Amino acid sequence: GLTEEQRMMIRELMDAQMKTFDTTFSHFKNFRLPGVPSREEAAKWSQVRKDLCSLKVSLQLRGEDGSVWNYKPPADSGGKEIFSLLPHMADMSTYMFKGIISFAKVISYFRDLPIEDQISLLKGAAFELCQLRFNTVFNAETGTWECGRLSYCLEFQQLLLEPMLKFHYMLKKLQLHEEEYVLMQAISLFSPDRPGVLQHRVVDQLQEQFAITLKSYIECNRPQPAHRFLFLKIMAMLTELRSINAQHTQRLLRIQDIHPFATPLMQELFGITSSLTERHKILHRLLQE
Amino acid sequence: LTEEQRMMIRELMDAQMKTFDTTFSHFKNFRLPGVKWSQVRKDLCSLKVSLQLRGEDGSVWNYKPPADSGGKEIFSLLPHMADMSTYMFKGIISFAKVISYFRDLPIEDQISLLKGAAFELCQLRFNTVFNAETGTWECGRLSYCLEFQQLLLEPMLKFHYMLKKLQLHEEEYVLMQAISLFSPDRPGVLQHRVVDQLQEQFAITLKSYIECNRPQPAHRFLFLKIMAMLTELRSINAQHTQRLLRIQDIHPFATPLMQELFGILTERHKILHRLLQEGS
Numbered sequence: 001g002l003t004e005e006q007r008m009m010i011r012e013l014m015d016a017q018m019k020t021f022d023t024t025f026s027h028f029k030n031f032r033l034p035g036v037p038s039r040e041e042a043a044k045w046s047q048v049r050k051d052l053c054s055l056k057v058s059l060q061l062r063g064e065d066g067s068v069w070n071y072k073p074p075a076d077s078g079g080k081e082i083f084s085l086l087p088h089m090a091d092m093s094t095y096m097f098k099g100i101i102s103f104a105k106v107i108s109y110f111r112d113l114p115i116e117d118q119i120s121l122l123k124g125a126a127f128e129l130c131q132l133r134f135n136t137v138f139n140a141e142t143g144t145w146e147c148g149r150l151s152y153c154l155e156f157q158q159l160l161l162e163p164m165l166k167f168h169y170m171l172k173k174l175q176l177h178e179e180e181y182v183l184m185q186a187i188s189l190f191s192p193d194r195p196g197v198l199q200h201r202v203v204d205q206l207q208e209q210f211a212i213t214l215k216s217y218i219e220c221n222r223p224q225p226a227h228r229f230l231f232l233k234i235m236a237m238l239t240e241l242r243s244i245n246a247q248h249t250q251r252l253l254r255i256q257d258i259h260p261f262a263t264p265l266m267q268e269l270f271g272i273t274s275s276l277t278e279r280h281k282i283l284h285r286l287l288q289e
Numbered sequence: 290l291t292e293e294q295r296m297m298i299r300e301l302m303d304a305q306m307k308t309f310d311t312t313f314s315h316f317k318n319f320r321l322p323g324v325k326w327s328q329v330r331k332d333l334c335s336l337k338v339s340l341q342l343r344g345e346d347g348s349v350w351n352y353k354p355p356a357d358s359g360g361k362e363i364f365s366l367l368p369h370m371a372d373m374s375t376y377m378f379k380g381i382i383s384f385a386k387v388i389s390y391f392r393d394l395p396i397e398d399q400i401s402l403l404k405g406a407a408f409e410l411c412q413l414r415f416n417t418v419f420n421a422e423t424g425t426w427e428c429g430r431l432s433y434c435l436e437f438q439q440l441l442l443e444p445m446l447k448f449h450y451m452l453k454k455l456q457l458h459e460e461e462y463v464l465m466q467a468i469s470l471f472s473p474d475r476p477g478v479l480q481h482r483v484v485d486q487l488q489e490q491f492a493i494t495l496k497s498y499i500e501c502n503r504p505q506p507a508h509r510f511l512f513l514k515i516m517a518m519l520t521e522l523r524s525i526n527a528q529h530t531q532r533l534l535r536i537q538d539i540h541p542f543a544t545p546l547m548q549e550l551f552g553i554l555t556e557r558h559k560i561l562h563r564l565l566q567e568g569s
């Protein structure tokens with residue numbers, strides 16, 4: 001079985017996930033909706049089209065009363081068309097990040113870290129934990145993220161070429177337990193090599209204890225040896241996600257540059273314009289309640 | 290065709306072109322569905338549509354309406370429909386105003402003719418953008434799609450299918466509009482005799498137009514079919530007015546212009562009087 005700390009550490013993470021993951025998105029509200037050239041400035045746009053080309057979704061909003069609003073995005077011509085959903089998605093991301101921040105605040109091991117490292121970790125990990133939560137509401141038969149009354153539907157070996165999409169299919173294929181998802185979130189959260197992390201050694205030892213807990217959970221709770229390598233598959237998914245995160249940051253900056261849309265909290269997280277707390281005032285304030 | 294008949298068709302066609310914006314480009318700022326009772330429900334059930342909105346950029350918003358669970362949700366599309374009806378009624382008012390035979394009537398009979406015919410002329414115009422294969426009224430960037438033997442038992446829907454089959458020319462539609470507009474026997478019409486003689490010359494002109502243009506055996510009796518169609522449209526009008534009043538009673542939604550036209554002299558129709566006093 002699992003040691004006592006390991007059982008308690010899982011309890012604390014499941015508690016924190018229960019308290020801060022709105023699995024029905026009931027409190028996502030007030031979001032924006034799509035309404036009813038220099039030589040190297042046009043090079044920028046052709047690059048931004050290469051960014052958004054495989055990540056195209058339609059949007060469904062189911063009303064209380066039974067009605068359905070459905071938004072199909074425009075085909076790419078050239079110009080503003082390809083950003084029509086970006087304000088909405090910025091609002092969804094921002095709402096997901098607030099739940100990630102609250103998730104981190106709840107965890108004793110994250111609390112007892114110095115505020116500047118809390119900022120650097122969340123800055124490094126927020127997109128990754130958002131993707132991990134999104135995977136739990138991904139329906140891989142229909143290519144759809146089911147977010148309560150909202151749904152994002154993709155529009156298939158071409159699809160499996162975009163790393164972000166191949167990540168969700170593969171991770172979904174593993175059929176992980178809630179406990180495995182929440183330990184994945186902790187391992188990603190406590191990554192000792194995020195930019196600006198000063199307490200490398202404490203964060204490294206925290207991560208390894210979460211990884212050891214997950215390794216033992218799998219040995220104890222799944223029918224060995226059919227799941228002989230599940231732990232290592234999960235670690236490889238996290239490594240791929242760390243790279244998807246880097247790709248996504250650069251994509252977001254390119255888009256932001258030619259078409260601003262990121263929220264103030266997204267600006268802080270992704271480095272969009274003194275010390276670390278002065279350049280992260282929102283994030284800092286959210287950590288202190 | 291006479292010279293007076295060629296002229297009259299020319300004026301009606303020119304009036305239609307000036308006042309029927311078939312791309313609906315200038316329909317904007319309308320309400321959208323948010324993001325006794327046993328009889329009101331009999332009314333709205335066969336007349337169920339979804340709504341489509343194609344944006345300039347190529348994007349599409351679709352609204353599928355809720356199924357009935359005995360609530361106010363059966364009325365979600367009514368504010369929007371009222372706005373569309375109100376844009377169409379203003380186009381119909383402009384159409385009547387550029388016709389010389391109508392401009393010349395007393396302001397009083399202008400008001401009564403428009404009260405009596407605005408719905409009919411709107412349905413005739415709607416019929417020219419009706420796609421009968423897909424059950425859709427294609428109004429530019431907006432489309433209204435019917436949610437079949439069950440449907441053909443709703444008289445307003447049967448009217449649209451039967452009229453489309455006749456395959457009328459623009460000239461026949463606009464003459465239908467004129468014959469319907471100049472009905473002598475509308476409530477409040479004083480100059481019965483004048484209106485009747487105008488109605489008769491539009492009907493004679495349609496009959497002659499149909500003979501100088503439609504030789505095929507597929508079009509035998511076309512003029513009489515059209516006229517019977519106009520009589521059915523007048524009955525559909527009276528039924529639509531009853532439905533509209535019931536629903537307004539348990540759930541207001543009518544625009545001020547609709548309230549004037551449907552009854553919810555010149556003094557009590559301020560908006561019509563004003564629009565009729567404005568130029569073209």
Ligand SMILES: C/C(=C/CC/C(C)=C/CC/C(C)=C/CC[C@]1(C)CCc2cc(O)cc(C)c2O1)C(=O)O
Nearest residue numbers: 055056057086089090092093134145152251252255
């Ligand atoms: C708004 C935004 C823009 C960053 C630039 C890119 C690459 C956007 C495409 C992102 C996209 C279509 C992702 C679909 C995949 C999931 C896995 C699907 C659901 C979802 C909802 C969101 O609200 C945000 C994201 C990223 C998201 O990705 C952001 O990154 O915030």
Ligand SMILES: C/C(=C\CC/C(C)=C/CC[C@]1(C)CCc2cc(O)cc(C)c2O1)CC/C=C(\C)C(=O)O
Nearest residue numbers: 336337338367370371373374415426433532533536
């Ligand atoms: C029958 C009824 C409403 C539904 C009428 C309906 C859904 C009709 C569909 C058929 C056409 C033939 C198609 C499109 C359309 C658009 C409109 O904007 C108005 C109407 C009547 C209309 O009917 C009574 C209330 C009157 C209203 C809302 C009005 O009079 O608005």
